[PDB]
Structure formats: C-alpha cells, structure tokens
C-alpha cells in the first residue's frame, strides 16, 4: 500500500527539476526533502508517492472556523499519510499530529544585502534608517507579536507602526525586497533559508547575528499512525550516521553558486 | 491511585548541584541548577508532585554489550526504578528503542575546548597534527561518537586518539577541563558544547570553545515506554520553549551568572 507523502515546493527542500517535463512521478522533484523522503522510505521499507500540499500552506488552525490548513490539514482530515517538509515542531501542531525528533535545527535570523551596516537584532532595534520586517503571517511574525523580551518587543512595535509596511506576502518577496532595496531593508526569516539564499546567485545577501530563538523541523504523521515509531527511529539513525549533515551540505554548499 | 513522581537525575554542573547549605535543607530543595528549575516547570505545567533522586550509578545510560544490562538513568527507567529522567540526557536511537523522549529542551553538539591561545580552529585542524594532543572522556557518548564514526576526519581522529601515548583520555569531565587548563596549550578537549560554553564563562576564564560543532543533537526528558506522563511532558517542553522560558533558563545558569564579563 503506497504511502501518500504530502510536501511543499520550497527551495532547496523540494523543487521541480529543470527537465521535469520529461520526467514522471517522484522523479519530477529534487531537493533536501526529496532525498530525505527516499532515505526514510528505504529505512522503514515502504513505497511512496510525493504529493504537493493542495493549498500551498504549512499548517495553521483558523481561530474562527477551527479548521486546519496546509499539510497539517491534510494529515488530520485524512488526505495524506505523512508530511516531509521544513515543518516546525510546535505545541499546537503536536496536539493534533505526531512529529519525529528534529531532522534540522534552526532559528529566526536576519538577512541583509551586503553592505548594510547592521550586525545583530540589537542594532536593528536601535535605529530606523534601515527598515526591517517579517512575513505578514506565520511563525516568525508571531515570535515578535508574542515575545516578552525587551528588544524583540521593541522591534515588534517598530514593525507594526513602520510605514510603508515592512511586512511581505511571501518568503520570495522578503528576499527580493532585501535584494532590490539598496541596503535599506533587512528581512527576518528562518536561518535555514537565510543560509541557503546566501549561497545563491547573485550572491548579494548575508546572514548576520545569532539566531533569535531555537526550534526544529520534524517529520509529521497522524496520531496513532503505524509509521510514526519507525519514522522517528529512521530520523535518529540518519542523524547519527552523519547522513543529515551530508544532505545539508549537498544542498546548501556543494550545489552552492557562491 | 496517585503516587509522587520519582525523578531520576544526575549531579552535573550547572544542571543539578547540591546547594552549599544543603545540610540545613530537605528533599528537592537540597539541589539547584538548570534541571532543577526545569523539573519545577514541567511538574507545574503537568500538575504532579515529584521527588528528585540522584542516579545510583552516576551514569547516563548505555547497554552493556556482554551482559545487555542498561546502566544509569536510562536503566532506571527501563527497569522501573524511576518515572522520569530530567538531565542533560541526549536523545539517541538506541535509547529511543527502549524509553520515550520529549522533543529536545536543549540543542547541542560535540565541540572542541582549548586553552586560550592554542593555534586550533576546527576538528580538521586537530586531525592534521599531533603537537597539540586531543582526547575525550574514557567512556560514554563522545568517545563512542568517534569510535563509530565513518566520517573521514572523525575516523582519523579516533585512530589517533586510540593509539596516542600517553593516554589522551580522561576519567571525568572535570579532569578533561583541568587537563586543558594545566597543559599550556598542548591538550585540547572534546566534549558537549553545552559544558564547553559553561566553562568558558567560569574563572579563571582561560578556556575557549572553537570551531563548528562536530554533530547536532538534543537533550530530552525521558519516560519509560507507555508512560502516562510522556505526552503531557512533551507538550510542556514545547510550551516552555515557545514561551521563551528555556532560553531564559539557559541565560540564568550560563551567562547571567557568568564570571568572565
Ligand atoms: N517552518 C515554517 C514554514 C516556513 C519554512 C521556511 Cl523554509 C521558511 N523560510 O524560507 O524562512 C519560512 C517559513 C514560515 C516562517 C517564516 O516566515 O520564516 C512552519 O513550519 O510554519
Ligand atoms: N549527554 C550525554 C551525557 C553528557 C552530559 C554532559 Cl553535560 C557532558 N558534558 O558536560 O560535556 C558530556 C556527556 C557525555 C560524556 C562526555 O562527552 O564526556 C549522554 O546523554 O550520554
């Protein structure tokens, strides 16, 4: 019985191959999660089909309707058997689905265009000449909305009140905005993506400062899933054998363009 | 029928330490540290009463190959002697096979400790020379990491360490640190990054953590398989992290109390 894998088009985790049109099935896709899915299925002994999440979302529960969207939605409503993607392990998600132990550790970080005289969160919060912001929705924004730490609360108030808006619709828009803003915009995003973009042409961005927090991506399965236990052991084994580090290197650095 | 939760832990600075005045104290209050504070939080969120007990054999948890017996805190859980372990206990495959772990409350990796001034910047640097000796604890997970590693650099280091004379291994973490401090830049110590960072903030302020971490892993709260507490404990850990409490706790024990500026 073929396992339905839900995932999301997010570089360099899952991308359509340049020559995808001459390809079929799983082979249409490449990336860190594509490689990880193969390793997991190999170790747990299952065949699987990669499917792209229908609504292009990760997974948030609507406050009013209480409906779950994205890949979490596909798990809880029975459309997919497992999610393999840069999906953060969080309390609200863990209440309705299971996560493996983390396959990648990350935190919120700062992206600047090279030349921008900013070196940390503190620096940013102490000035306004260089605008800075986050995705207009989701986890990073929420970190600042809910934060009780002085400097981060400060940054948050600055962001809500800054004009024009410092928020962006998509991660790509955030990156593009840093790139086209001639050193006058800084983007706060997950460190994994920051580190990746830093190795891509035109090589005009960099990561500065330490991560503002600490979290991890996990493989997700429905509660009670007969795959959950084996998938978790697979992630730990892959980590312990150095495979996860090797996959990170392959996709961030070896295939790097800088 | 409800019973007090038996917590197994271990004396390891700054996770769990006996208070200077422990003699005039009783029970849990004899102890202080990061893991003491964390246990308080977990129990508070999960709503259980608990008793801190120190692991009888002073070990974290490994299965003897010959006897097949699990020692340490893992063993306590596996053999039914404790309800939960709260300590710098790494989540690993062989342990997950026999107990449950929460998601990590702390992230870490194997790292290099040097005496300040030592001309070494990475594992790669160490492996390519022998003038500056380097080693690990004479047992446990860091040594086992190098023994099992099929990564070229780490295997080469293992081969060097196993054959180096005099012995580059040490009996305790304290010994390794002391050896770094006394060896005039001629000994480098491989240990978990958490402890490395801690020691870096302690007088005489003569050590330094250098290079990237050699691996990536996490410490987790452990319960016996099928335990009733496992689920609630896991959600508690996630909440504490998201609420910023785990970072604040690490700051308290590592940096606020820091002795090196
Ligand atoms: N891990 C997030 C999804 C996500 C993934 C990536 Cl890889 C990036 N990113 O490219 O910086 C962002 C996000 C959303 C937060 C953000 O704005 O960083 C989740 O589980 O909700
Ligand atoms: N997390 C390890 C135990 C441990 C804890 C600490 Cl706090 C340090 N350390 O202070 O460097 C080391 C170890 C492992 C021995 C060693 O590497 O010396 C486990 O679960 O086996």
């Amino acid at each position: 019985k073929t396992v339905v894998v839900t995932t999301i088009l997010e570089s360099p985790y899952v991308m359509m191959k340049k020559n995808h049109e001459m390809l079929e099935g799983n082979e249409r896709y490449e990336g860190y999660c594509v490689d990880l899915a193969a390793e997991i299925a190999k170790h747990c002994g299952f065949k699987y089909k990669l499917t792209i999440v229908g609504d292009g979302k990760y997974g948030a529960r609507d406050a009013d309707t209480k409906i779950w969207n994205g890949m979490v939605g596909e798990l809880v409503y029975g459309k997919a058997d497992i999610a393999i993607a840069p999906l953060t392990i969080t309390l609200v998600r863990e209440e309705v689905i299971d996560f493996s132990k983390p396959f990648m550790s990350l935190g919120i970080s700062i992206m600047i265009k090279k030349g921008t005289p900013i070196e940390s969160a503190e620096d940013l919060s102490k000035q306004t000449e260089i605008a800075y912001g986050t995705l207009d929705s989701g986890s990073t924004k929420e970190f600042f909305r809910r934060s009780k730490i002085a400097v981060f609360d400060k940054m948050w108030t600055y962001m809500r009140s800054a004009e024009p808006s410092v928020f962006v619709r998509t991660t790509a828009e955030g990156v593009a905005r840093v790139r086209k803003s001639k050193g006058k915009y800084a983007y706060l995003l997950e460190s994994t993506m920051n580190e990746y973009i830093e190795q891509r042409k035109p090589c005009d961005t960099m990561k500065v400062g330490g991560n503002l927090d600490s979290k991890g991506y996990g493989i997700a399965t429905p509660k009670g899933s007969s795959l959950g236990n084996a998938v978790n052991l697979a992630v730990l084994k892959l980590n312990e054998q150095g495979l996860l580090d090797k996959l990170k290197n392959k996709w961030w650095y070896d295939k790097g363009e800088c």
Side-chain angles (χ1 to χ4, degrees), chain A residues 145-164:
Chain A
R145 181 194 306 271
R146 273 205 276 259
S147 184
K148 287 326 205 82
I149 305 169
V151 167
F152 301 152
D153 182 57
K154 179 186 193 177
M155 293 172 63
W156 168 241
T157 295
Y158 154 80
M159 295 192 229
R160 280 190 102 172
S161 64
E163 296 191 290

Side-chain angles (χ1 to χ4, degrees), chain A residues 10 13 58 86-88 93 135 139-140 171 189-190 193 217:
Chain A
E10 187 85 85
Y13 297 95
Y58 283 90
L87 181 64
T88 306
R93 287 173 181 161
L135 207 70
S139 179
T140 299
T171 292
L189 75 177
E190 305 195 340
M193 177 64 75
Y217 299 153

Side-chain angles (χ1 to χ4, degrees), chain A residues 33-129:
Chain A
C33 286
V34 179
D35 286 355
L36 179 60
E39 290 282 351
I40 297 295
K42 182 155 68 84
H43 277 94
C44 309
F46 61 84
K47 295 180 183 169
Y48 65 98
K49 180 68 175 301
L50 295 182
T51 70
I52 304 298
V53 53
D55 66 11
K57 304 299 182 191
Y58 283 90
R61 176 182 44 200
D62 190 286
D64 302 302
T65 67
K66 304 187 180 319
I67 295 174
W68 282 92
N69 73 9
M71 293 176 281
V72 175
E74 285 195 355
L75 299 182
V76 301
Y77 304 133
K79 301 306 283 279
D81 298 311
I82 182 175
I84 306 185
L87 181 64
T88 306
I89 297 165
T90 67
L91 174 58
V92 294
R93 287 173 181 161
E94 192 89 282
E95 287 174 338
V96 303
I97 61 185
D98 292 326
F99 278 104
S100 69
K101 295 312 187 292
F103 65 84
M104 197 175 285
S105 298
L106 66 307
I108 290 162
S109 67
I110 297 163
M111 174 189 293
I112 56 168
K113 181 173 185 203
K114 284 172 177 173
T116 310
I118 286 282
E119 283 173 335
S120 64
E122 172 162 9
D123 285 0
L124 278 180
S125 80
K126 276 157 33 201
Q127 58 83 68
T128 64
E129 176 85 51

Side-chain angles (χ1 to χ4, degrees), chain A residues 219-253:
Chain A
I219 293 193
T221 49
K223 279 193 150 25
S225 163
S226 68
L227 284 178
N229 184 249
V231 160
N232 185 60
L233 301 186
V235 173
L236 300 171
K237 173 177 296 172
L238 293 177
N239 188 23
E240 280 167 29
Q241 294 179 344
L243 195 152
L244 297 188
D245 294 322
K246 189 174 170 63
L247 272 189
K248 172 81 171 279
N249 191 67
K250 166 179 166 180
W251 287 102
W252 269 247
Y253 297 106

